[PDB]
Design an enzyme around this catalytic site. Structure first.
Site, PDB file in Angstrom:
ATOM      1  N   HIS A 139      17.248  10.990 -57.783  1.00 19.16           N
ATOM      2  CA  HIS A 139      17.882  11.068 -59.100  1.00 19.16           C
ATOM      3  C   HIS A 139      16.886  10.977 -60.242  1.00 19.16           C
ATOM      4  O   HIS A 139      15.794  10.413 -60.095  1.00 19.16           O
ATOM      5  CB  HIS A 139      18.916   9.959 -59.314  1.00 19.16           C
ATOM      6  CG  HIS A 139      19.624   9.532 -58.069  1.00 19.16           C
ATOM      7  ND1 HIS A 139      19.373   8.327 -57.457  1.00 19.16           N
ATOM      8  CD2 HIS A 139      20.585  10.137 -57.328  1.00 19.16           C
ATOM      9  CE1 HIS A 139      20.149   8.200 -56.393  1.00 19.16           C
ATOM     10  NE2 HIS A 139      20.884   9.293 -56.283  1.00 19.16           N
TER      11      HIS A 139
ATOM     12  N   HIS B   4      16.449   8.998 -63.517  1.00 18.44           N
ATOM     13  CA  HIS B   4      16.902   7.781 -64.185  1.00 18.44           C
ATOM     14  C   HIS B   4      16.538   7.825 -65.669  1.00 18.44           C
ATOM     15  O   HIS B   4      15.714   8.649 -66.092  1.00 18.44           O
ATOM     16  CB  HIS B   4      16.284   6.555 -63.515  1.00 18.44           C
ATOM     17  CG  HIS B   4      16.825   6.281 -62.150  1.00 18.44           C
ATOM     18  ND1 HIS B   4      17.347   5.058 -61.790  1.00 18.44           N
ATOM     19  CD2 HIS B   4      16.906   7.066 -61.051  1.00 18.44           C
ATOM     20  CE1 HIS B   4      17.721   5.100 -60.522  1.00 18.44           C
ATOM     21  NE2 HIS B   4      17.478   6.311 -60.058  1.00 18.44           N
TER      22      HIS B   4
ATOM     23  N   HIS C 287      29.025   7.865 -60.790  1.00 17.38           N
ATOM     24  CA  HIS C 287      28.055   8.511 -59.911  1.00 17.38           C
ATOM     25  C   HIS C 287      28.692   9.531 -58.954  1.00 17.38           C
ATOM     26  O   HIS C 287      29.786   9.304 -58.444  1.00 17.38           O
ATOM     27  CB  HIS C 287      27.296   7.460 -59.091  1.00 17.38           C
ATOM     28  CG  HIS C 287      26.383   8.047 -58.063  1.00 17.38           C
ATOM     29  ND1 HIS C 287      25.146   8.562 -58.383  1.00 17.38           N
ATOM     30  CD2 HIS C 287      26.526   8.215 -56.725  1.00 17.38           C
ATOM     31  CE1 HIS C 287      24.569   9.030 -57.291  1.00 17.38           C
ATOM     32  NE2 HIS C 287      25.383   8.826 -56.271  1.00 17.38           N
TER      33      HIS C 287
ATOM     34  N   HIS D 299      26.657  11.840 -62.651  1.00 14.75           N
ATOM     35  CA  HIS D 299      25.660  11.630 -63.690  1.00 14.75           C
ATOM     36  C   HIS D 299      24.825  12.897 -63.838  1.00 14.75           C
ATOM     37  O   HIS D 299      24.600  13.614 -62.865  1.00 14.75           O
ATOM     38  CB  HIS D 299      24.736  10.463 -63.287  1.00 14.75           C
ATOM     39  CG  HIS D 299      25.439   9.148 -63.108  1.00 14.75           C
ATOM     40  ND1 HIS D 299      25.204   8.316 -62.033  1.00 14.75           N
ATOM     41  CD2 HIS D 299      26.350   8.513 -63.882  1.00 14.75           C
ATOM     42  CE1 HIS D 299      25.933   7.221 -62.160  1.00 14.75           C
ATOM     43  NE2 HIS D 299      26.646   7.321 -63.267  1.00 14.75           N
TER      44      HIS D 299
ATOM     45  N   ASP E 104      22.054  13.141 -61.321  1.00 11.90           N
ATOM     46  CA  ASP E 104      22.385  13.136 -59.901  1.00 11.90           C
ATOM     47  C   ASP E 104      21.951  14.401 -59.139  1.00 11.90           C
ATOM     48  O   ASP E 104      22.637  15.431 -59.184  1.00 11.90           O
ATOM     49  CB  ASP E 104      23.895  12.894 -59.726  1.00 11.90           C
ATOM     50  CG  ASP E 104      24.300  11.445 -60.012  1.00 11.90           C
ATOM     51  OD1 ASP E 104      23.419  10.556 -60.069  1.00 11.90           O
ATOM     52  OD2 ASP E 104      25.507  11.167 -60.163  1.00 11.90           O
TER      53      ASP E 104
ATOM     54  N   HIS F 165      14.814   7.234 -53.184  1.00 14.58           N
ATOM     55  CA  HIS F 165      15.418   6.008 -52.676  1.00 14.58           C
ATOM     56  C   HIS F 165      15.183   5.841 -51.173  1.00 14.58           C
ATOM     57  O   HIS F 165      14.766   6.776 -50.496  1.00 14.58           O
ATOM     58  CB  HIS F 165      16.921   5.983 -52.994  1.00 14.58           C
ATOM     59  CG  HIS F 165      17.225   5.804 -54.452  1.00 14.58           C
ATOM     60  ND1 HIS F 165      17.478   4.572 -55.012  1.00 14.58           N
ATOM     61  CD2 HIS F 165      17.298   6.701 -55.464  1.00 14.58           C
ATOM     62  CE1 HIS F 165      17.710   4.716 -56.306  1.00 14.58           C
ATOM     63  NE2 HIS F 165      17.597   5.999 -56.608  1.00 14.58           N
TER      64      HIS F 165
HETATM   65 CU   LIG Z   1      18.080   6.846 -58.248  1.00 16.82          CU
HETATM   66 ZN   LIG Z   2      24.265   8.709 -60.297  1.00 16.35          ZN
END
Ligand SMILES: [Cu+2]
Ligand SMILES: [Zn+2]
Ligand SMILES: [Cu+2]
Ligand SMILES: [Zn+2]
Lengths: 153, 154
Positions: free
Chosen positions: A44, A46, A69, A78, A81, A119
């Site tokens: 993602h 941020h 999300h 988002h 995303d 992540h």
């Molecule tokens: Cu993230």
């Molecule tokens: Zn998100």
């Protein structure tokens, strides 16, 4: 036309380019990530290009449209995303090859100066039916990240 | 509305540099500090690309939307990115950064968001050197630390 780039810093490395031909067109996101564990990894943009506290200070997912999300194809998501990037093997090189119409390199949805985060776990695309799912996609820890910067050409 | 950005410097030396702008039309205030500099002046500029693919080298040249030659921040002819020198009063200390500039911005044509801040090994001669490098790099020499300038929380 516009170009941006992110060099990841953390448990994995890689260079991710962002190309956008016109303000109206989608952004093409390409490059490669190295050292990912086999499996799906949340991916993602941020909000903040702030790494004073590692990936933690990047804040939440970039969310100028004030939504919950989701995955990149979710009706609710988002702007930041971008779903999962997937390593087909342990310790290999994962290709990044994404196109997205929400993010941009210009205007209010511009991701210039924000942070790309990788992540540890899969993004569940907001389908976990809990508070975490609607916020983080249960993607777990932030294993690498970088500020998205203007690139040559 | 008021804007903020931040840059974390990594390399031979380290530091955190903040950028604050109250209005699209006001100057940018730059604060923070750099740790580990050798005594003396060190060149300090915003470079055009926020590109770390080849270390600080890929940050390219000094940010120059107005197509000018190199100078100091007070030079009539300068790059937008030209922020002069930071001076370490001692070896291996922490040097305070305290700058205000009206050419750089956090918005618009001159926005430095997504670009790279670079600290150099040698002093920037502010384009008053007697060679070709002076009018381009200020003879600031090696890039000893850099970071990408990113949006920061209000
Ligand atoms: Cu993230
Ligand atoms: Zn998100
Ligand atoms: Cu420089
Ligand atoms: Zn210059």
């Amino acid at each position: 036309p516009a170009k941006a780039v992110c060099v990841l810093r953390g448990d994995v490395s890689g260079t991710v380019f962002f190309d956008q031909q016109d303000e109206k067109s989608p952004v093409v996101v390409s490059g490669e990530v190295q050292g990912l564990t086999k499996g799906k990894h949340g991916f993602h943009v941020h909000e903040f290009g702030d790494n004073t506290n590692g990936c933690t200070s990047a804040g939440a997912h970039f969310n100028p449209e004030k939504q919950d999300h989701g995955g990149p194809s979710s009706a609710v998501r988002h702007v930041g995303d971008l779903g999962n990037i997937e390593a087909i093997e342990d310790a290999g090189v994962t290709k990044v090859s994404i196109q997205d119409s929400q993010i941009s390199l210009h205007g209010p949805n511009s991701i210039i100066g924000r942070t790309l985060v990788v992540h540890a776990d899969p993004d569940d695309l907001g389908l976990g039916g809990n508070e975490l799912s609607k916020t983080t996609g249960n993607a777990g820890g932030r294993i690498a990240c970088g500020v998205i910067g203007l690139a040559k050409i």
